[PDB]
Structure 1
Amino acid sequence: PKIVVVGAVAGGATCASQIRRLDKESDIIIFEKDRDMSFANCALPYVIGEVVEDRRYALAYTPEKFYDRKQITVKTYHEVIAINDERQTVSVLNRKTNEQFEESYDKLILSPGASANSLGFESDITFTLRNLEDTDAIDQFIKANQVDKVLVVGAGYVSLEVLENLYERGLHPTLIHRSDKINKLMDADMNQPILDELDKREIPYRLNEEINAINGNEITFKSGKVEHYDMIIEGVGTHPNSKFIESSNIKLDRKGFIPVNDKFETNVPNIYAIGDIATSHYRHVDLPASVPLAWGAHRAASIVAEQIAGNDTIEFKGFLGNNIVKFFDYTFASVGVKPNELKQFDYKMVEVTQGAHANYYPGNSPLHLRVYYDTSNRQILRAAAVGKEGADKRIDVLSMAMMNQLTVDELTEFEVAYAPPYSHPKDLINMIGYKAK
């Protein structure tokens, strides 16, 4: 079949690559509205912090390399502006010529993702971070203006990683957030170490704070405070790139996302949707789920590839919502339903705080593990872990447990790999099980 793909990054380029792996004869074309395909979204803050300095890490492919290795045609600076589903074409705008045209397809795959929100100030010193063009612009503004002092707005993983990286680059960031609900994928009371790490390094922050006015480098805040900053990075949420889809017969939800089935089909024949734009359901509970992260994009890419050119018995089973972020010395990880989704269940909570490993083994740090479960069937609903060591391991194990519909009580049976540098004879995970009794 002729295959058209919208977006050439996490979902799009992966899906197209996976299809080629299976089908060597279908013609495949990808339209990407911006300059680069296959950029490393998740590497971006580390590029800014000069942790990553080889561009070969920031960008996996050029369209030329992509064609030469995989025979996939990628048109950058081409923005799809409409989907004409009844005639099986998309309308595409060549941004270089400002000429538009129709491209036909047998199968269409939508992976446009999402864009960064902006606060909307008229400001030459304010930037968002979503792609490599953004990253290049920030790096350039920093150098050309000898930036020292940077204001970071927002407190999600993107803003937190940018802050840490700006600090390590040798700059002087300040963090503000409109409320005190930082890092909201994590249980609110488990985020204290973020503030501790800031304090330890004498990095200023103000919560319940906003930009009120901007005049050159003079920044006036809601609190009444006035300071001067050389630069601002806004990380104040995202929104779905689905405007171009609204005129079509494709069903969108009221927030602009695309509900899909377990084959990542939309309501329209021959049209699939994957990545941040797509919504689905949880694997372990009968609720809708939207998990705009890397894992879901890659997994859907593979499933769509099988559907089109491989084994169409292969279907999605739902999300668990596993997620993680590093902030300075600490790791923050969670899986399962979001904090706000718990109220839909009659649940209880159990928790343990314990050294990640043997106390007498040097380098210990306490690890807080919390697990929520359903009282009506003992099923695990959510888990969260925070500590300098061992949090990722604990959450991945609980992710596998939930995949298998394990009960909280069954966690006593988890046979951990134990030696002093790694865990305990009754691991934190085991202790969750004993304490639920």
Structure 2
Amino acid sequence: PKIVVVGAVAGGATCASQIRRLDKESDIIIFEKDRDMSFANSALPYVIGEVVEDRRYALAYTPEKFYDRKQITVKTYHEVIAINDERQTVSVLNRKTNEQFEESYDKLILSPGASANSLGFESDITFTLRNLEDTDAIDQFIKANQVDKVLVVGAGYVSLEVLENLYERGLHPTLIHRSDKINKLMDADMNQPILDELDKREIPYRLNEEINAINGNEITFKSGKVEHYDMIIEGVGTHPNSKFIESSNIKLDRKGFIPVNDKFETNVPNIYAIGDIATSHYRHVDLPASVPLAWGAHRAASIVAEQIAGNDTIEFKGFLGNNIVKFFDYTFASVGVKPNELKQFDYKMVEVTQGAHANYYPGNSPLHLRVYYDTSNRQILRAAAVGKEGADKRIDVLSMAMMNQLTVDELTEFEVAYAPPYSHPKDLINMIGYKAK
């Protein structure tokens, strides 16, 4: 079938590649509105911190390379501006010429993702981060202005990674956030180490703080404070890239995302939507979910490839929402329903704080693991772990347990890999099970 993919990055290039693995005959074209395909979105903060030095590390492919290797055509600086879904074509603006044309399809895959929000100030010193053009502009500006003091606005996990990288590069960031709900995928009492790590490094922060006005480099804040900053990086949320879809028959929710079934189909035949634009449901509970992270983009890209060109019985089973961030010496990881969704259930909480590994073994640190379960059926609803060591291991185990709607009591039965450097004969996970009675 002739395949048109919109977006050439985490969902779209992956989906196209997966289809080509299954099907060597079909014509596949991807349209990408910006300069680069297949950049490593998650590497971008580390490119700013110069922790990833070789900036080609964050760019897997050029169009010429993709055609050479996979016989897939990728057109950059080509923005899909309308879907003419009844005629099965898309309208495409060639952004270099400002001429538009239609591209026909038998199957359309929409992976256009999300764009950064802006606070909307008229300011040359403010930047957002979503692609490699942005990473380049930020790096350029730091060098051209010898940036030292940088205001980081927003306290979500990417803004935090940007802050850390700026600090390691030698700059002096201050963090602000409009509320006290920092790193909101993690339980709010368990985010305290973020604020400790900032305090330990004397990196200033102010929560429930916002920009009121910008006059050149002089920033006035809601608190009444006035400070000079050489550069501002705004991490103030994202919005779905669906304006080009509104005129078509595809159903959007009230926020502009595309609800999909378990085959990533939209309500319109022959159109699929994957990645951050798609909304689905949890695997382990009957609630809607949106989980705009890399794993879901790559997983949906594979399921859609199977749907189109492989085994059409392969269908998504829903999300668990496994997520994680590093901030300085700590890891913060959670999975399951979000904090604010716990109230849809009758639930209890169990938690342990114990050494990541045997206490006498050096380099130990306290790991805090918390699990919420549903009192009607003992099923695990959510887990969270924070520590210098071992958080990602416990959370990945519990994601595997929730995939199987395992109960909290069955955690006593989990058979850990135990030697002194790694865990305890009764691992933290087992202790949750023992403590749940």
The correspondence of residues 66-81 of structure 1 with structure 2, limited to 5 A, is 66-81=66-81
2: distance between equivalents of 1:208 and 1:102? 48
Summarize deviations over 1:43-89 as a string: whole Å, max 9, x none.
00000000001122110000010111000000000000100000000
Q: What corresponds to 1:256 in structure 2?
A: 256
Summarize deviations over 1:353-394 as a string: whole Å, max 9, x none.
011011111111100000000000000000000000000000
2: distance between equivalents of 1:53 and 1:80? 33
TM superposition shift of 1:405: 1.2
SS in 1 for 2:353: strand
Summarize deviations over 1:80-119 as a string: whole Å, max 9, x none.
0100000000001000000011110000000000000000
2: distance between equivalents of 1:10 and 1:224? 42
1: distance between equivalents of 2:181 and 2:323? 17
TM superposition shift of 1:182: 0.3
SS in 2 for 1:57: coil
TM superposition shift of 1:268: 0.5
2: distance between equivalents of 1:357 and 1:69? 45
Summarize deviations over 1:6-43 as a string: whole Å, max 9, x none.
00000000000000000001000000000000000000
2: distance between equivalents of 1:422 and 1:292? 32
Q: What corresponds to 1:95 in structure 2?
A: 95
1: distance between equivalents of 2:364 and 2:210? 38
2: distance between equivalents of 1:205 and 1:56? 33
1: distance between equivalents of 2:358 and 2:430? 15
SS in 2 for 1:33: coil
2: distance between equivalents of 1:254 and 1:212? 29
2: distance between equivalents of 1:53 and 1:429? 38
2: distance between equivalents of 1:362 and 1:177? 37
Q: What corresponds to 1:202 in structure 2?
A: 202
2: distance between equivalents of 1:327 and 1:206? 17
The answer to whether the aligner puts 1:434 opposite 2:434 as a matched pair is yes
Percentage identity across paired residues of the two chains: 100
Calculate the TM-score normalised by the size of structure 2.
1.00
SS in 2 for 1:102: strand
1: distance between equivalents of 2:285 and 2:151? 40
SS in 2 for 1:377: coil
Q: What corresponds to 1:82 in structure 2?
A: 82
1: distance between equivalents of 2:6 and 2:161? 28
Calculate the TM-score normalised by the size of structure 1.
1.00
1: distance between equivalents of 2:352 and 2:96? 58
1: distance between equivalents of 2:228 and 2:147? 11
Q: What corresponds to 1:359 in structure 2?
A: 359
SS in 2 for 1:396: helix
1: distance between equivalents of 2:408 and 2:79? 48
TM superposition shift of 1:314: 0.5
SS in 2 for 1:29: strand
1: distance between equivalents of 2:149 and 2:406? 49
SS in 1 for 2:56: helix
SS in 1 for 2:236: coil
TM superposition shift of 1:419: 0.8
1: distance between equivalents of 2:310 and 2:56? 31
SS in 1 for 2:326: strand
2: distance between equivalents of 1:268 and 1:178? 39
Summarize deviations over 1:225-244 as a string: whole Å, max 9, x none.
01100000000000000010
1: distance between equivalents of 2:210 and 2:55? 35
Gaps of 5+ in 1: none
1: distance between equivalents of 2:419 and 2:62? 46
> Structure 1 stretches (4+) deviating beyond 3 angstroms?
none
Summarize deviations over 1:211-252 as a string: whole Å, max 9, x none.
111011111111000110000000000000001000000011
2: distance between equivalents of 1:420 and 1:70? 47
1: distance between equivalents of 2:119 and 2:392? 34
Q: What corresponds to 2:345 in structure 1?
A: 345
SS in 2 for 1:354: strand
Coordinate RMSD, CA, aligned: 0.4
1: distance between equivalents of 2:401 and 2:147? 47
TM superposition shift of 1:207: 0.7
2: distance between equivalents of 1:130 and 1:157? 14
2: distance between equivalents of 1:172 and 1:322? 32
Q: What corresponds to 1:384 in structure 2?
A: 384
2: distance between equivalents of 1:150 and 1:356? 35
2: distance between equivalents of 1:205 and 1:317? 41
Q: What corresponds to 1:125 in structure 2?
A: 125
